[PDB]
């Protein structure tokens, strides 16, 4: 059975999300067409919150950057609209507690504002990338003889040879190279490690785990804000700290 | 002649008058001398600088304030029926008795010496048609103000009580304990009839 309160709450929250996404869609469409006559702001800010919580306000350069998008689950009563289904299908992040690597350009950044209440972003370090690939990694390929959908593990390097090989990639560390440094084979290996499977925080419902989830749940709204405006500054967080928690 | 108002909209209507008639010299009459000790505290608190006259204050104060009202130009006082007997001032335009009077016959003599009107829902000159929308929205402001001062809680307590005690010690068929206390309390701003 579905209660009445929930069924109205879902619509009341998606009203805010449909109107919010349309609003961001309009200002980003009017920013690209150079018809900046009467809008809120014709440029892009990025907020970098670090750790006693300093909120930085820096403008986004034209430079291509490397991001590690992490799935969150938020907000509460929301059902995802068509514009969210599309972007999260393209980034293959339908599952909660799931990461992916993408390069950030002037085309990537407008799509980032749409999914910002669903994802937590940030520029990782060399150890965050390297430890993540050597700890977690999936490869969708053929099983014994018949079965196709096996996703196993990055155990070997000869599997890396058979699937990539001729692009110049021979080993798992070479995949780490083309992911950390933006190269030719990045679009080749990015869809090879499809997504990552990060474990959730706390990971229990009980005595200690409920209280620890309470402590972290109130830490969420402090370390992350929903701007909801068409000039939403993109919240960047420390991924070295976050993946220290998720590894 | 008279204005018809409920016990809720009684002091509401009075307060609506005194702000607009700040320029003029008008007279408000009460039954009790313990009712004026409330009104001449509220109106001085909400900055309508009225004058105070009752039996419970000293004679030199009663003389030196009433003298100042005679020599004034813009002033306004609050006095009872019994205390204002024999000393009437021609410098007046509205004689407005708020409570029911002591003698229903002697009040006629009080007038022809100014414009006279009464206030009666439970109970010559013309009546006055009254707009319901343009009363001042100072009731919840007074309800917050009463339960946060103590002194004005006590003066309202002995405002409401003394008024209602004088209402029961009347003689007319009209003024014989008919008015319900769920309305009369909100005149002095209460959630319960004390």
């Amino acid at each position: 059975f579905v209660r009445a309160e929930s069924i109205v709450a879902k619509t009341l929250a998606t009203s805010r999300e449909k109107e919010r996404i349309k609003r961001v869609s309009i200002l980003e469409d009017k920013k690209a067409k150079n018809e900046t006559q009467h809008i809120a702001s014709g440029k892009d800010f990025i907020l970098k919150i670090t750790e006693g919580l300093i909120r930085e306000k820096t403008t986004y350069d034209g430079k291509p950057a490397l991001l590690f998008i992490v799935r969150v689950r938020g907000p509460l009563a929301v059902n995802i609209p068509n514009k969210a289904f599309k972007i999260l299908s393209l980034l293959r992040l339908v599952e909660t507690n799931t990461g992916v690597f993408v390069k950030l350009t002037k085309n990537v950044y407008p799509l980032l504002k749409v999914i910002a209440p669903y994802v937590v972003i940030g520029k990782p370090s060399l150890s965050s990338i390297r430890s993540l690939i050597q700890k977690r990694g999936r490869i969708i390929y053929k099983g014994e003889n018949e079965a196709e959908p096996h996703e196993i593990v990055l155990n070997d390097n000869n599997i890396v040879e058979e699937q990539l090989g001729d692009h110049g990639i021979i080993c798992v560390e070479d995949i780490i190279h083309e992911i950390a440094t933006m190269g030719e084979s990045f679009s080749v290996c990015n869809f090879f490690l499809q997504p990552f499977k990060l474990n959730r925080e706390v990971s229990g419902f009980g005595s200690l785990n409920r209280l620890r989830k309470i402590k972290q749940r109130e830490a969420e709204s402090r370390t992350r804000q929903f701007s909801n405006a068409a000039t939403a500054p993109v919240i960047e967080v420390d991924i070295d700290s976050l993946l220290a928690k998720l590894n | 002649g008279y204005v018809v108002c409920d016990s809720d909209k009684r002091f509401l209507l009075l307060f609506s008058f005194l702000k607009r008639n700040q320029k003029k010299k008008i007279i408000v009459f009460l039954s009790s001398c313990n009712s004026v000790k409330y009104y001449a505290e509220l109106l001085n608190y909400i900055d309508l600088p009225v004058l105070e006259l009752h039996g419970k204050q000293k004679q030199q104060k009663r003389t030196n304030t009433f003298f100042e009202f005679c020599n004034a130009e813009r002033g306004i006082l609050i006095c009872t029926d019994v205390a204002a007997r024999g000393l009437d001032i021609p410098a007046v335009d509205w004689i407005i008795q708020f409570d029911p009077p002591d003698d229903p016959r002697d009040y006629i003599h009080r007038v022809g010496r100014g414009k006279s009107l009464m206030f009666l829902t439970p109970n010559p000159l013309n009546e006055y048609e009254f707009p319901e929308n343009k009363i001042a929205n100072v009731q919840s402001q007074l309800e917050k103000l009463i339960k946060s001062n103590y002194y004005l809680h006590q003066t309202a307590k002995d405002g409401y009580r003394s008024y209602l005690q004088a209402y029961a010690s009347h003689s007319l068929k009209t003024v014989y304990q008919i008015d319900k206390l769920d309305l009369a309390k909100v005149a002095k701003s209460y959630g319960f009839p004390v």
């Binding site: - | 206390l181 009839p193 004390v194």
Partner: protein, 50 residues
């Protein structure tokens, strides 16, 4: 009307004096030094249990 006509006390409107008594007891305890203040209690655990 309510059943009894009991006059409401001053203390029902004024800030509480029992609270004032407790506060001015802990004040003494801090002057004497037998209660360590909440600000310094953080500093006693920032230096210890490392």
């Amino acid at each position: 009307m309510p059943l009894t006509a009991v006059p409401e006390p001053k203390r029902r409107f004024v800030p509480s004096k029992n609270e004032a008594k407790r506060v001015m007891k802990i004040v003494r305890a801090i002057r004497e030094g037998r209660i360590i203040p909440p600000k310094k209690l953080k500093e006693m655990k920032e230096k210890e249990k490392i």
